[PDB]
Structure formats: structure tokens, C-alpha cells
Design a protein around this ligand. Structure first.
Ligand SMILES: O=P([O-])(O)O
Ligand SMILES: O=P([O-])(O)O
Ligand SMILES: O=P([O-])(O)O
Ligand code: NA
Ligand code: NA
Lengths: 420, 324
């Protein structure tokens, strides 16, 4: 999947790897601030912070930072510190996402006129990459999958309305930008604004996404690239652990925490079914209690499914909920995932966590078909009997999502359908 | 769009990769569909030398040749027009490009998840040039009852029999999801005369063939009388169905449900399991697409829970009017 990167990450890569005749100014002149920053060491490392006025803004995958009032412009370092005092560590809702402002970027202020500001954006579609340019309704050009984008192409198709004295430098920069976009497997790159003064090119702003599946191609250039969570979410070590399992195997293992304290947990097979189960849970009023989104698929082994399930079970036994908790172990009728092997891995995790699961008043609902599903359902029923955990087990004769309404109390549990 | 018909009871395929369980499942299907001959003519696997692999045709042990080099497999099997590529993500691009140097190949299934989008776009460009239909990447494939089964799709004989996948009914479907395609086999077999053809286009942002590519094939296939689409959050593909109805191109009844309605209720953006399942604009949400489809005259259930009910209602109306 395509993943956003911070402005700092994108600029670090751009300054290292772009090829252009244009003289890009202020390369690597940025400084990162967090609630833990020691300002004396920050200044030791970036003495240019004293040398001219500054711009400060979050770098947390928030868009429209200027229109949100979140850019402090033309400030002394003392003015930046004052600007950060009410903001650093503050809660912020942006749109409908709510998080904490904890990562900021400081850069030199660049005096310039509005006529010296430009907009550039590149983004991927099925048919190629569109390049947008606006002096400030933007000019727009499709670059086909096998096409080059040379400076003369940019002048002809995109710079018709650009100041004559800036066409050469703009065309060179944009051509280099496009080659950089391709070589590092970007899918989205926006500079808003690009500034060109008498002294050269300044990148005042950057947002970007890279195709994270290209790590095996790009790792030498990307390095230990960071993909932050979207604004409004945190990153969790359990997510990184599952991601590391996912990276080792053809099997698919995915986990995103939505609400660690929620009482509704899922452990569903398939990218499709996992979404359908999430849809059903939310249709029945459970959005605020849905703890996770994730899935396993592509025939994981018993051991992979064990390591996956133990992560979930640990996560759901961190603190008690007054009404107990629910675990939805669901899926389609699988095409080739071994349901006995995968459910034996889950059962082993359930056994290892039976004490905590009982302490946290967990009820488990199961629906699954596929290869060897009858034995998979049997071992689920048996681990419930031996541990005393309530587990309600259904097969191909139960509608896929029926266990959601059962688990949430909207419909009775049909014992006449167990194991079928 | 490309060929209307991809598979028949005479289809022969080459399988790239050492996937003996998937091949044997295809042969079990071929046998109960009463095909004259196995659907897999040869395998390509560069990590071993040329050899023959044992398989079963009913009770009978048979031999299928495994080639180190694709050129030898193609040369010795000119009857093959399908390749099913189980290459790892690292080499799926090169082996799919290689396959398209063979004019005999008219359809390619690409199984692997994790192929970079920019590489898949190059595969699509070459396939479009040549008129080759790509199913995938990141898919289990698809199934045409009576005729041909891609790889693991539909599983083993117990499921093929249970869902009546050994002979075609009147209902065609397309989904991103492999798992859910086999759920659709089950639902459709219980509510109608059964699946005619199903395709899983895969989870990636740029599927080698789209929902509309296959909906058009089904519109143009006389044996298909109704079409089911399990759509998904992300991208704007399903609006092409609205457009095709408006234009009078799509006249058979279409039932569609787009999964991912939960994303509208979340406070942050969520990437779901399929690489392509992330809404980058309001128009790409499942809620938006479901509404547009309903307004265009698609039969859209209230939720996934009512999909089976609406399929059965459309089917019974078509029986009543003598279409089926
Ligand atoms: O703050 P942004 O929208 O220019 O990235
Ligand atoms: O038809 P079979 O299974 O006896 O060979
Ligand atoms: O495509 P899946 O992950 O739903 O099988
Ligand atoms: Na994986
Ligand atoms: Na999957």
C-alpha cells in the first residue's frame, strides 16, 4: 500500500537524491522539535536557527497547515518558542481526527513575493502520473507510463503562464523532481509552495506518499524510512510486530489498533471478510467499542496464526471492562487456508491466555468454513469446554456475519446450528 | 474491454511455480466437471531441472511435465492460452512480462500480493497493447463452473460439490476479495441456479482487469442472466457501472454491495487489508458508491446481510418473466 511520509523524510530524500541544474537553497536546513527537545542541544546542532528569522509548523501528516493557523511565519527563535508554548503537546482536532501536536519542523524564513510562489504536484493514476503546475486552475499534464518528462516538455505543456525569467529554472527543477519521484517509487508528491527568488529554488512545503511495497527495490536509497500513523492515531509495538511477521511471508498478517480499550475485538480471516465484519459491527452501534481492524489470510501456518492470536489476546487482557469483552473469530468459506491448522494455532493461544481471558470476561464467537474446517470447529469447541471460556462455534450453515448480532445481543444464539 | 470469453472446457494452462496442491485441486475440479482432459498442461519452475510430476486424474496416476525454462513449456504446448503465475512478489513482474512475449497466451492470472503499483502499471500497459487479459495481482483468481478453475479458487471437491460449482448456473459475479468470492459461490448456489462465472480481480490499487471489464463480459455472454458485484471502498471503479446502465450498455440486472461502510464512522483514515482499499476522496467511500449505484438503478441491499435476499428476489423475478 501507499504510505505517507513526513515532510522531513521527504525533504531529506529530495535534497539527497534530486538531480537538477537548479540551485536548491537551504538544503537540510530544518530542525525537528518534540515535547522532549532540549533547546540547548537543538541549538548546538543547528546554529543557523539564530542567523535569520524562522518558520515553524507541525510535521505530523496534517494538511492545510496554513489555513489551520498552524504555521508561525517570520519569527525569531524566541518567537518560535513562544509560538510553541500553547501548541507543543496540545490536543488538536483536524477535521474529525483528534490527536496531540508533538512533532514540529523549524526552517529559515525566506523573504519573497507572492509572484515568487509556485505550486507543483505529481500523483499516480492507472494511466500514468499527472503533473500539476500553478503560478501563485493549475496547468496539468498526464505523463504516460513509459514517457519521459524533459525540461522542454515542461516548458511546452506546463509553463505557458510562468514568468519568462523563471521558465528555465522551473523546468529543470520539475524535470528533476519527476525523475526523483519515479526513482524512489513515490505515488504522490506536493510542494505548496515552491519559491523561486533571485537566489534560487526553495522547497517551503512538502507532502508525499511512497509505495511501501517497493522497499525491496529502494531500501538502499530509502534507508530506515518511517511511515507515521495518520493524524488521530498512535503507533503501537504490537502493530510493528505483526508487520514484521507480514514481511517474512507470503501469508498476509495485518493489524491496526483503533481503540485499545474497546470491548469488541476481531480476529477474522481475509481482507474482504474482515471489512464486512467491521461494517456489521459498526452498523449495530459498536464503532466506539471496536478495538481493532486486521486480518490473516493466504494460508498462514499454525505457528504464524499462534503468534498473531497471542498478540490479540495480550492486547485484550490489559484492563477490564465492566461489561466483559467479545472476540469475533470469523471468516469466509476459505479457498485454501487450512482451517484446522490456523484454528489450532488460535486454540493454543487461547489455552496460554485462559486465565486472563476468564479474568476479563471474554466471550468468543466463531464462524468459519474452508479446508478442514470441521476439525477447526471441533478444537474451538473443545478448548471452550476445557478452559471454561464461553465459545459459540458455527460453520458454513450460519450466515457469515450472524455471529456479530449474536455477540452484541441483537439476536438469540441458535444452538441448533452449532458446528455446521 | 478485451475478450468476452476467457475460459472454456478446452482451456489448457501453464502454472508458473511449484504449486502441486493447487494443480491437483484444478484436476479434481476438471474431473467432476467431466472435462475430457486436465486443465494444466505443464508447469514452469526454474529452481529444478526438467522433470515430470505425478498427479491424479480420478484414481489414475498421471504425469504433468515441469520445465525449467518457459520457452520449452510454450514450445511443447501450443494448445495453452492461459498462464497462472504463482511467482513470488520479487519475480512476478519479470515472469509476467516474459509470458507476454508468447502470442499463444491470451489470459494471465497473477497471484502474488506485494507487487509495486508502478510495476503493475507497466504490466497493464503491455497487456493492453497485446489484448491479454490479466486477472490479479493479489488474487486467488476465479472460477468458471464446468470449464476452468484458477489455482486454489473454490478449494477442494467437498466445496465444489456443496456449492454446485461442477456445472454453470445463470449468475455471474466479480469481487476484489478471494475469500468473499468463495462465500459468494455459497450464497449464489443457495439462492439461484448457481454461478456461471466468477472472477476475483484482486486487492491492488490498479487491478490488471477491472470490475467494469468483467461486468461487460458478462453483459455480452448469453448464458449470464444476472450479475453480482461485491465492490469495495477505494477508487471510483463502481461509478462505471452507473454510467454503463445510464448508457444502455448494461441491461441485465446488476446486484452490487460495496464493503467498507465502517470507514465513514471512523475518526481517522484506515488502510484496510487490500492495498487498494483506502478512500483518498469522499467519492471513494463505500457509502458514497452504494448510494450512487442505488440511484442509477442497481439493486443495492441495505447491508451485506441482505445481499442474499436481494439476489434471490432478482433471480425469481427473472424466472417469472421467462428470462431464466
Ligand atoms: O500544509 P500542506 O497542505 O501544504 O501540506
Ligand atoms: O472415477 P474414479 O475415481 O474411479 O477413477
Ligand atoms: O482477498 P481476501 O484477503 O479477502 O481473500
Ligand atoms: Na506477508
Ligand atoms: Na488475503
Amino acid at each position: 500500500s501507499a504510505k505517507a511520509i513526513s515532510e522531513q523524510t521527504g525533504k531529506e530524500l529530495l535534497y539527497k537524491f534530486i538531480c537538477t541544474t537548479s540551485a536548491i537553497q537551504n538544503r537540510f536546513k530544518y530542525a525537528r522539535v518534540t515535547p522532549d527537545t532540549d533547546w540547548a542541544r537543538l541549538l548546538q546542532d543547528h546554529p543557523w536557527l539564530l542567523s535569520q528569522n524562522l518558520v515553524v509548523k507541525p510535521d505530523q501528516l496534517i494538511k492545510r497547515r496554513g489555513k489551520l493557523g498552524l504555521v508561525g511565519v517570520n519569527l525569531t527563535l524566541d518567537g518560535v518558542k513562544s509560538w510553541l508554548k500553547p501548541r507543543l503537546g496540545q490536543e488538536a482536532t483536524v477535521g474529525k481526527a483528534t490527536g496531540f501536536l508533538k512533532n514540529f519542523l523549524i526552517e529559515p524564513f525566506v523573504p519573497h513575493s507572492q509572484a515568487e510562489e509556485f505550486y507543483v504536484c505529481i500523483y499516480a493514476t492507472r494511466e500514468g502520473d499527472y503533473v500539476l503546475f500553478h503560478h501563485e486552475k493549475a496547468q496539468k499534464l498526464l505523463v504516460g507510463v513509459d514517457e519521459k518528462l524533459n525540461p522542454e516538455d515542461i516548458k511546452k505543456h506546463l509553463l505557458v503562464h510562468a514568468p519568462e525569467d523563471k521558465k528555465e529554472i522551473l523546468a529543470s527543477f520539475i524535470s528533476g523532481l519527476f525523475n526523483f519521484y519515479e526513482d524512489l517509487y513515490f505515488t504522490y508528491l506536493e510542494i505548496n509552495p515552491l519559491v523561486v527568488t533571485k537566489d534560487g529554488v526553495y522547497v517551503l512545503d512538502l507532502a508525499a506518499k511512497v509505495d511501501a511495497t517497493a522497499d525491496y527495490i529502494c531500501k538502499v536509497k530509502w534507508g530506515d524510512i518511517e511511515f507515521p500513523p495518520p493524524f488521530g492515531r498512535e503507533a503501537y509495538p504490537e502493530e510493528a510486530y505483526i508487520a514484521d511477521l507480514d514481511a517474512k511471508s507470503g501469508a498476509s498478517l495485518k493489524l491496526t489498533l483503533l481503540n485499545p480499550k474497546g470491548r469488541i475485538w476481531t480476529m477474522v480471516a481475509g481482507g474482504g471478510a474482515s471489512v464486512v465484519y467491521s461494517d456489521t459491527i459498526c452498523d449495530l452501534g459498536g464503532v466506539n467499542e471496536l478495538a481493532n481492524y486486521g486480518e490473516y489470510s493466504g494460508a498462514p501456518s499454525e505457528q504464524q496464526t499462534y503468534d498473531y492470536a497471542k498478540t490479540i489476546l495480550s492486547l485484550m487482557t490489559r484492563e477490564k471492562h465492566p461489561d466483559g469483552k467479545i472476540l469475533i473469530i470469523g471468516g469466509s468459506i476459505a479457498n485454501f487456508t487450512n482451517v484446522a491448522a490456523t484454528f489450532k494455532g488460535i486454540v493454543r493461544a487461547i489455552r496460554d491466555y485462559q486465565g486472563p481471558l476468564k479474568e476479563h470476561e471474554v466471550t468468543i464467537f466463531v464462524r468459519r468454513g474452508g479446508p478442514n474446517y470441521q476439525e477447526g470447529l471441533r478444537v474451538m469447541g473443545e478448548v471452550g469446554k476445557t478452559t471454561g471460556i464461553p465459545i459459540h462455534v458455527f460453520g458454513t450453515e450460519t450466515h457469515m456475519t450472524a455471529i456479530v448480532g449474536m455477540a452484541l445481543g441483537h439476536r438469540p444464539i441458535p444452538e441448533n446450528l452449532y458446528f455446521q | 474491454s478485451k475478450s468476452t470469453t476467457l475460459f472454456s472446457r478446452h482451456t489448457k494452462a501453464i502454472v508458473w511455480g511449484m504449486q502441486t496442491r493447487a494443480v491437483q485441486g484444478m484436476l479434481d475440479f476438471d474431473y467432476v466437471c467431466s472435462r475430457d482432459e486436465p486443465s494444466v498442461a505443464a508447469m514452469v519452475y526454474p529452481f529444478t531441472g526438467d522433470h515430470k510430476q505425478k498427479f491424479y486424474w480420478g484414481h489414475k496416476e498421471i504425469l504433468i511435465p515441469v520445465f525449467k525454462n518457459m520457452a520449452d513449456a510454450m514450445r511443447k504446448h501450443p494448445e495453452v492460452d492461459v498462464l497462472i503465475n504463482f511467482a513470488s512478489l520479487r519475480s512476478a513482474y519479470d515472469s509476467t512480462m516474459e509470458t507476454m512475449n508468447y502470442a499463444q497466451i491470451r489470459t494471465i492470472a497473477i497471484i502474488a500480493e506485494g507487487i509495486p503499483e508502478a510495476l503493475t502499471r507497466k504490466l497493464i500497459k503491455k497487456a493492453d497493447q497485446k489484448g491479454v487479459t490479466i486477472i490479479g495481482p493479489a488474487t486467488v483468481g476465479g472460477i468458471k463452473p464446468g470449464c476452468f478453475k484458477i489455482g486454489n479458487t473454490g478449494g477442494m471437491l467437498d466445496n465444489i460439490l456443496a456449492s454446485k460449482l461442477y456445472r454453470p448456473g445463470s449468475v455471474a459475479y466479480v469481487s476484489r476479495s478471494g475469500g468473499m468470492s468463495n462465500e459468494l459461490n455459497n450464497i449464489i448456489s443457495r439462492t439461484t441456479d448457481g454461478v456461471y462465472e466468477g472472477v476475483a480481480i484482486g486487492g491492488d490499487r490498479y487491478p490488471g482487469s477491472t470490475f467494469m471489464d468483467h461486468v461487460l463480459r458478462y453483459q455480452d455472454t448469453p448464458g449470464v442472466k444476472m450479475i453480482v458485484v461485491l465492490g469495495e471502498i477505494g477508487g471510483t471503479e463502481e461509478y462505471k457501472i452507473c454510467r454503463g446502465i445510464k448508457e444502455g450498455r448494461l441491461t441485465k440486472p446488476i446486484v452490487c454491495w460495496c464493503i467498507g461502510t465502517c470507514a465513514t464512522m471512523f475518526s481517522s483514515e484506515v488502510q484496510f487489508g487490500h492495498a487498494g482499499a483506502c478512500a483518498n476522496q469522499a467519492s471513494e467511500t463505500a457509502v458514497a458508491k452504494n448510494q450512487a449505484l442505488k440511484e442509477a438503478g442497481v439493486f443495492v441491499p441495505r447491508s451485506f446481510d441482505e445481499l442474499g435476499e436481494i439476489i434471490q428476489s432478482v433471480y425469481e423475478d427473472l424466472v417469472a418473466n421467462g428470462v431464466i
